[PDB]
Design a protein around this ligand. Sequence first.
Ligand SMILES: [Ca+2]
Ligand SMILES: [Ca+2]
Ligand SMILES: [Ca+2]
Ligand SMILES: [Ca+2]
Lengths: 141, 369, 29
Amino acid sequence: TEEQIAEFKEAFSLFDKDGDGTITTKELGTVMRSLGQNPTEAELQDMINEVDADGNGTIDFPEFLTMMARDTDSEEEIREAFRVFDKDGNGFISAAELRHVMTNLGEKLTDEEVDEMIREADIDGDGQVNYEEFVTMMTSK
Amino acid sequence: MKIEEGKLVIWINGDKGYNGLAEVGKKFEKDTGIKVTVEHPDKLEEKFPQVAATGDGPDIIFWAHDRFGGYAQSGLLAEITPAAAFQDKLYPFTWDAVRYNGKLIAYPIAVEALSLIYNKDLLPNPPKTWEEIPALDKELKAKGKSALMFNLQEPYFTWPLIAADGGYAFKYAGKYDIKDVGVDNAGAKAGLTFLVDLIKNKHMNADTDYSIAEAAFNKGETAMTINGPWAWSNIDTSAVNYGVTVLPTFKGQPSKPFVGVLSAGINAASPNKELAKEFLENYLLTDEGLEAVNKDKPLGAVALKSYEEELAKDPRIAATMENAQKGEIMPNIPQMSAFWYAVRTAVINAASGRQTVDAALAAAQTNAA
Amino acid sequence: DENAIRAAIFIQKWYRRHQARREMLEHHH
Ligand SMILES: [Ca+2]
Ligand SMILES: [Ca+2]
Ligand SMILES: [Ca+2]
Ligand SMILES: [Ca+2]
C-alpha cells in the first residue's frame, strides 16, 4: 500500500535526522540511546549490515522498505515498545511517560496533544494506557 | 462489539466528544432497553468500506459529509427518513450537504469553515475587504510586523478568495453537474490574480504553509491569519489577544470558504435502522444531546438551530457559522479528488511565478476529469 | 531479527497516527 509507504518514510525520517536519504550507525545509536538503550558500536554495525544490501555502511529507504516488508511475532516488538514507555514498570503509560519518550525522540507535541493522545488511547477511562489498550492502538495499522 | 440486532454500535473519530456521545447512549439505554456502544477506531473512515456489509462495521458512522458520497455510491448508506418537521429544526443549507442522487443519506451534526483570525493588539479593527489589506501591510511592515499570513500550499485555504468573485468546484436541484466546472471563469481568475499580486508585491510569501503561518500569528508577528476552529486551541495557549470574524470581501462579494458538515450515516446493512433513526433524532439531535457531546469536546457550530443560537453567544462560533452560510458546501462526489490535485498545482505554479494565472487555471479547468 | 529498529518504529507509531490525524483535521499536509 502507498499509504503505508508514506508512514514508513516518516519512520525512516526518525533515524535520518539530517535527511540525506541514508541511515548511519551514528544515527541509529542516537535514536536507541534516546530510548534509554545501551548498544555497542558492534551491535550498531550488525543492525545496519543486516538491512544494508549495498555494502556501503548505510541503510537507504529501499533497503528500509524491503526489510519492513520481510512478520510472525510483532507481539514481542510491541511489548518491547510498551516496556520503553512504561519506564517505572507499573503496567500503565501516563501522560508524563508519553511526554518523556516523545521529547526524547524530538517529536514536538503540546501538552494538550499529549493529553489528547492519552484520552483516545484510554478505553476504560482510568487516565492511563495499559497493555491491551496499547495493543489496540498499535495494531490498528 | 460486532453488529447485533437489538443493539447499536457507533463509530466516531477520536477527536470528537465520544464520551459525551456515550452519555447519550446511556440515557437511551435508560429510557429504552437498547444498549449503545460508542467506539472510536483509528482510520474508521477507511475501515468502513472494507467491513461495512460483513457485520463488523457500525450501525452508525459519524464523519465529514464529503466522504459519504463515495459511501452512498458504493451502496453502504441507508436512506434517511426524517419528517419535514424534524428537518426544519436544522439550518436548511446543512441538508444540502447530505444528499446523494437526491436522497438524504446522513444527519447533519456540526458545521465548520475557515474564518478571519486577527490580533486585536496589532489591529483593533479587522479589514472588511481584501482590497484594503496591501495598505495594511505597508503600515505594519513599517512597525516590523505584517498584515496577513495563512497557508498558501493547500487549495482548501486559498479557495475562499478564488471563489469569492464567481469561482466554484462543480455546479449544484440536489445533484452535482460534473460537466460544469468553475475554475476558469472570470471570478476565479480575478481572485487568484489578487492572491498572486499579494505575493508579487511581497505582502505574502509563496512558500508559507500551515506551520509557518501558525507560528507567526501565535508569536504576534502578523496581524491576521485564516484558519478553522481546530486552530483556536493553540492560539489560546499562545495568549495572543485575538478575534475571529467574517472573512474579508473581494470585489464587494463575500469570501466563499468550503463548508464541512460532521454527519451521522446509517449502515445500509444494519438490522437496527429504526432504532438508529430514533437514537439520532430526539436523543442526539436535541439541545441536551448535543450539549453532552459538546461538554466532552466542543463541536464548534452545530446544525441544530436552537442550540447553535446558544453557542453563537461565543462570537468565534457566530463567525464560523456566518462564514459557513456564506460559503460553498464541499462537493461529496469523487471527482473532488481530481479537483483537489488540479487546483493545488495551479496555485503553487501561479504563486511561484513563471506561470500565467490564466494559463494555470486553464490547465486546472482541464485536469478535473 | 532487527528487533530494536522495529520496536523503535513501533514506539514512534503513536506519534505518526496522532500527527496524520491532526493534519487531516487541520486540512493540510
Ligand atoms: Ca542520514
Ligand atoms: Ca546501503
Ligand atoms: Ca506510571
Ligand atoms: Ca486506561
